[PDB]
Design a protein around this nucleic acid. Structure first.
Ligand SMILES: [Zn+2]
Ligand SMILES: [Zn+2]
Ligand SMILES: [Zn+2]
Ligand SMILES: [Zn+2]
Lengths: 72, 78
DNA sequence: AGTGGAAATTCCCACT
DNA sequence: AGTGGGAATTTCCACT
């Protein structure tokens, strides 16, 4: 039912993990980019539908911990 | 050496009663004339600086209010 | 000649 | 995959 990163409604199994649409594109863009994100808090931000855009660092870290990878 | 009391960017003057940068100036103007119902993803004490000030509108707005920013500030003056 | 409004324009991102 | 919005810079305004 739900995205394993933000708990929004999932669309399918993207990059190896059940995710929503925005989390898919975000992950792609993050890995392909020269992207070193930095948390403004404690590296433990709440990632949900409303807040997920607040911290790319914690969102990216949740993507990786969930096992996402450009190979399915 | 004068820096934005909200995000430590380079300050551009005293705006709304407080030493701040152009971006924090208009962020505050935007936040107070509109609805400002932001939600913090951390614990309402996020670090606000030039690279991160976009992460948490909630804490940024909070630092603006805590610093004393207010639209009516220049108007007094008397 | 020097400050600080607000508006306008441009730039940057999110999700669709 | 094009509309919408947020952020940030640039500009012009009144008043010293
Ligand atoms: Zn998601
Ligand atoms: Zn975070
Ligand atoms: Zn600032
Ligand atoms: Zn915050």
């Amino acid at each position: 039912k739900l995205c394993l990163v933000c708990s929004d409604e999932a669309s399918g199994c993207h990059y190896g993990v059940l995710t929503c649409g925005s989390c898919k594109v975000f992950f792609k863009r993050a890995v392909e980019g020269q992207h070193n994100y930095l948390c403004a808090g404690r590296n433990d931000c709440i990632i949900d539908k409303i807040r997920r855009k607040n911290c790319p660092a914690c969102r990216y870290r949740k993507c990786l911990q969930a096992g996402m990878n450009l190979e399915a």
